[PDB]
Design a protein that fits this description.
The structure is a homodimer.
Chain A: H1 3-6, H2 8-25, H3 61-65, H4 80-103, H5 132-165, H6 172-175, E1 177-180, H7 195-200, E2 210-211, H8 215-236, H9 242-245, H10 265-268, H11 273-285, E3 295-298, H12 303-307, E4 322-325, H13 341-361, H14 364-369, H15 394-397, H16 402-409, H17 414-425, H18 430-462, H19 486-496, H20 499-505, H21 508-518, H22 527-530, H23 539-559, H24 568-583, H25 597-615, H26 628-648, H27 651-654, H28 659-671, H29 679-682
Antiparallel strand pairs in A: 1-3, 1-4, 2-3
Helix pairs in contact in A: 2-20, 4-5, 4-24, 5-26, 8-11, 13-17, 17-18, 18-23, 23-25, 25-26
PDB class: transport protein
Keywords: ion channel osmolality gated, transport protein
Assembly: dimeric
Chain lengths: 689, 689
């Protein structure tokens, strides 16, 4: 009815998107498709798309790890490894698809709503003689095999991380740590009291000391200058373009009211007299004792000298001398620093409140989105066909996928606001910010996409019963309420699981930017350099995206086994596209380890628990509570295994062992007899000037 | 009815017990009352008991801490602070006692069961909209003041502990740590691989090394000899007593069949030869290579040298090289050691199963106890008065306190079995064993004394309705079910809160032992030494006892405010008696810190949460859910405060700061310039031979 027509409007677009890829692949000026390599007719129709599809899989793991994205091989464990894990799912689907072929063929009255002879293999006939037995026993293997596979998965991951841990160069991460909340100096000393403590304790050849001053007094204008340079080019570019043909007019309005811009040298004076003077004073200020926030960097002899010390509490109150692992110099978010510790709590509570209100004002969009999808049952009693368009025509009824596509439009703008809020909260490193943001986003979409959707789809479905209806008064709502929502997700997957990924290969956003930059009247001036500034930073959006699909599948796998065939079809294409885009062109620069896989486990395990707890609440209303023993002992053994893993393998992942540290230190000291480590570590964390 | 007569049978015994104390205080031979001091007529009726009652309170805190029980002043922070914390409740009880005098004096039908005009100030009249307002508002101060007081309490405790932390002598606890799960030696090396690892790392002047072999191969015969010495004396008294007057006969059955013993020298030969060779062989065994258990002791320069190292994970797998803080040499439980790590899990699961079955077979005792308490409603329809005894006489009806007293008899023997099971589980130190045992005991009595009692008191009360009864079919059970149980606790407190404590001063158990030892025909041979072997080790029993009383009071404070007057009356005498027993004679030696107070907080906070969750479940079934907003926001703040405390003050209590360590190390090094620390640390942890 709806799924039979929703597959054409998606495949017909995916093919066109894939064809344009091969079309624009053999171009001349747009070399962004392979911008990373130079860092240092039926012939082309049916035999031209295989130029990179089978070649992408020909990269062994060693070659991937030993290439760009040193810490990205573990990221490729969501698609490449995803299929493997999902394999056990397709294998068991190969056996449960027969109950689907042996439960749908049982015809009955089928009075669900109104004589709908469709896919209804879920609740054909209640009180099944010998049919629900398999439906209950399958839950065992549904968990036992996936956990057994995840066990080996986490084992392989830990082994490869430990191996890679012994094949790393000399980075300042293990050397330099960040110590904050130094006691307030008695208005006389700035650093005489800091170093005085690091010498009484284990000296370990205390290296240079860097006192962090108030960031957001000079860093503000530093960023303004980094931006005024682009604006300088935007203002200097008009003086080398307009006058090329003839000086006639300028842009003018460009935002606020006003006729047009006056001159160029006059606009260049704004960043000169008013630009230099303002920057000259604050640059003298940071070389003066105007404001010195209690924050600094500490180092030791080698990695072991800092790993053994940066793990305990120095003082006797957990509010002073907070020692953390400083990230790489490229990941330091120098802007949102020098924040007092007292406010860190407030910014965690106030900003949270504003978030809790967003959920209350973001409920009507779902209703407005879930009100134009399934016409049948809405326009039957109160409303009717409106003029200028006939709804009886199939061309009007096949538009059920329109809201599914329009939903994405109302979802790509809020992540930016969420990121801005998380930045306003204030943290230490961006590696943790990029993870907490996604963590908050997922829990936001959890109580809204899954728990917030059904609650709104049942009320809007039952409150439309006026005359020609059924009982529906007290109890006759929870029976068939979830199966009715699967029709929406079927379309959601086709509009987001197929086009959402295809829309990223073409890069419709940055491509227009490149075309615009191509009209900058520049021959070779930094053309090879500014064209590789934007990257492919999509972790914040991609990480919560896969978990939703995993949750939906794990929940509907036992209810609707007809959805598991339509999920891997896309997972494969996403995996190969990401494999293609990782090695060829990604421009990723944020590696700080792989400390995000346990976060996935503990968040899919709770997802499985949620599914098992929701299963016992629907099929247990038929008759006797004969199914409760299994659905109550399974989640117990589920968390028991989780606890076991958290005790066995988790501590070895987020911590730093001291046995391999000395082992690696011995070799790194026996290879290079010269010290030569205080040179690049002194001027490692500083400002541009 | 029952509480009016239960107070006489308890007070009349407490006075008799207190009088016997003063009687036996001025004795000559029984000097056990003041055995710790020599370690180096209306005149005596109304003016003789005040000889030690007001004097015990005249000991300042400095004198208590600077006396026997260095880590016992914090244990008295239970009765002393208890009353202080109660003071707030008491202060509140004074204001709420008027609502009690203004809610009970309003007479109504009072058809609870059968025209029982008694203390029924709980649910006299329906809502009224003029009385429950105060009952709902009082819950605020019920928690806010106690939390505010506990805040200052935990603050004072932390400060005094940190102060005491800088006034301790040189103990081997901070110096010697226990490292277990050393990798299995390759059948060639015993200790050559230990020092090999500790010399590549931070040397820190690695002190002597002790390899722990299989404990339960020599420890067995060591204990058999320590016991055979007592048996040797028990066999020598046979020759020192019977031949004194005349040799006539000897012992007989003595547990097993047989006429009588044969001779003395023949019984003394058992210890030697067969018992001598056995010990001779295994003593040679421990000196030779037979079984080298992977466990040893590690030391460093000073306390700081070991505190900074014994806090992280050495290896990369959290199953090898487990480093723990070794207790004092007197607390080392050498018997239950050398246990493999693989079994530690099994012993934690199997022994647990056997425990979970005990709860299923320990349910009928409660039912038998609550079968003869309130004969009113039990002997009314099916049973009647039995011959040879008339129940209509008050002398027979006043026996309601008999089961309350008999319950204690069925409760003093199971703690020993629990202790034996906890020992069989296997741990490292006794300081943790003595705490986990009490921890298990409390959770055992929690689901049985409180949750297991009411469930069994309601069923047995509702299943006795045959003819002259009321509805009692579907809903008519939760109305008045908890108020009916208060009568049982009123008697429980008088039979255990008054006599249980008084029964400890006289020491009816060890006193008989002393009288028997007095007939050993010994003039001065170690009489001053063997008479001080038994101590006053009652922490395992006393710690769970107070929490039950606290829980009952905190739960009934809002329901039945008539119980709070009858709890402090005893807490005061318990406190003074414990002060007396701590100052004069306690003979305890298990001090290993004070890391047990947070365990109390986190276990009374959950108790308060349980009370607040049980209140919303009884009075919210009357009508509208107008009380749910308060009873749902209060426990949230309760958890908000608990987490805040856990974040703020808890880490500073269980851990060892590195700031004060160096401070104390500087002084301890500046006072004694000589090293002189390898002497007493070498032969610090060894066997008797």
């Amino acid at each position: 009815t709806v799924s039979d027509i929703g597959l054409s409007a998606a495949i017909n677009v995916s093919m066109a998107v894939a064809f344009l890829l091969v079309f624009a692949f053999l171009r001349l000026q747009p070399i962004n498709d392979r911008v990373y390599f130079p860092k240092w007719l039926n012939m082309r129709s049916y035999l031209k798309f295989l130029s990179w599809m089978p070649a992408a899989l020909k990269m062994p793991e060693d070659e991937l790890i030993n290439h760009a994205g040193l810490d990205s091989a573990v990221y490729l464990r969501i698609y490449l490894t995803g299929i493997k894990i999902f394999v056990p799912i397709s294998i068991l689907a190969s056996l449960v698809l027969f109950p689907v072929n042996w439960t749908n063929d049982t015809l009955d009255s089928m009075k669900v709503v109104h004589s709908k002879i469709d896919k209804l293999s879920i609740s054909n006939i209640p009180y099944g003689s010998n049919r629900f037995v398999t439906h209950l026993v399958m839950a065992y293997a549904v968990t036992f095999w996936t956990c057994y596979v995840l066990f080996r998965e986490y084992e392989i991951i830990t082994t490869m991380r430990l191996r890679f841990l012994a094949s790393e160069k000399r980075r300042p991460d293990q050397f330099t740590v960040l110590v904050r909340n130094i006691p307030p100096d008695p208005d006389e000393s700035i650093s005489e009291l800091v170093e005085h403590f690091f010498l009484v304790n284990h000296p370990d050849h205390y290296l240079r000391h860097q006192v962090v001053y108030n960031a957001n007094k000079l860093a503000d204008l530093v960023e303004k200058k980094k931006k005024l340079q682009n604006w300088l080019d935007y203002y200097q570019l008009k003086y080398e373009r307009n006058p090329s043909k003839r000086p006639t007019t300028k842009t003018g309005f460009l935002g606020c009211f006003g006729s047009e811009v006056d001159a160029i040298e006059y606009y260049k004076a704004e960043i000169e007299k008013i630009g230099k003077e303002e920057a000259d004073e604050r640059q003298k200020i940071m070389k003066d004792p105007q404001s010195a926030v209690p924050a600094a960097f500490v180092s030791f002899r080698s990695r072991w000298g800092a790993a053994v010390c940066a793990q305990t509490q120095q003082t006797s109150n957990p509010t002073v001398w907070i020692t953390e692992w400083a990230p790489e110099p490229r990941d330091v978010y120098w802007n949102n620093l020098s924040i007092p510790f007292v406010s860190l709590t407030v910014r965690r509570l106030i900003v949270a409140v504003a978030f809790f209100f967003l959920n209350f004002f973001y409920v009507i969009p779902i209703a407005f989105v879930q009100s134009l999808a399934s016409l049948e049952g809405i326009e039957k009693a109160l409303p009717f066909l409106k003029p200028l368009i006939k709804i009886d025509v199939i061309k009007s009824f096949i538009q059920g996928f329109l809201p599914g596509i329009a939903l994405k439009v109302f979802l790509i703008l809020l992540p930016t606001i969420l990121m801005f809020m998380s930045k306003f909260e204030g943290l230490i490193s961006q590696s943790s910010l990029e993870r907490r943001s996604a963590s908050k986003y997922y829990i936001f979409l959890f109580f809204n996409v899954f728990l917030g959707s059904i609650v709104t789809g049942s009320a809007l479905d039952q409150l439309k019963a006026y005359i020609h209806q059924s009982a529906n008064e007290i109890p006759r709502t929870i029976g068939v309420a979830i199966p009715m929502r699967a029709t929406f997700f079927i379309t959601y997957v086709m509009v987001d699981g197929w086009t959402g990924v295809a829309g990223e290969i073409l890069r419709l956003r940055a491509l227009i930017i490149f075309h615009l930059k191509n009209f900058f009247l520049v021959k070779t001036e930094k053309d090879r350099e500014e064209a590789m500034d934007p990257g492919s930073i999509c972790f914040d959006w991609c990480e919560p995206r896969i978990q939703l699909y995993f949750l939906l599948g794990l929940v509907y796998a036992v209810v609707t086994p007809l959805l598991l065939p339509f999920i891997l079809v896309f997972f494969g294409l996403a995996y190969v596209v990401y494999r293609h885009q990782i090695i060829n062109v990604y421009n990723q620069q944020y590696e700080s380890g792989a400390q995000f896989w346990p976060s996935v486990h503990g968040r899919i395990i709770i997802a499985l628990i949620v599914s098992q707890l929701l299963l016992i609440g629907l099929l247990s209303t038929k008759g006797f509570e004969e199914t409760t023993p299994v659905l109550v002992v399974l989640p117990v053994l589920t968390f028991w295994f989780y606890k076991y893993c958290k005790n066995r393998f988790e501590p070895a992942f987020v911590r730093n062992p001291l046995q391999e540290a000395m082992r690696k230190d011995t070799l790194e000291r026996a290879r290079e007899p010269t010290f030569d480590l205080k040179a690049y570590l002194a001027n490692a964390y500083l400002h541009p000037v």
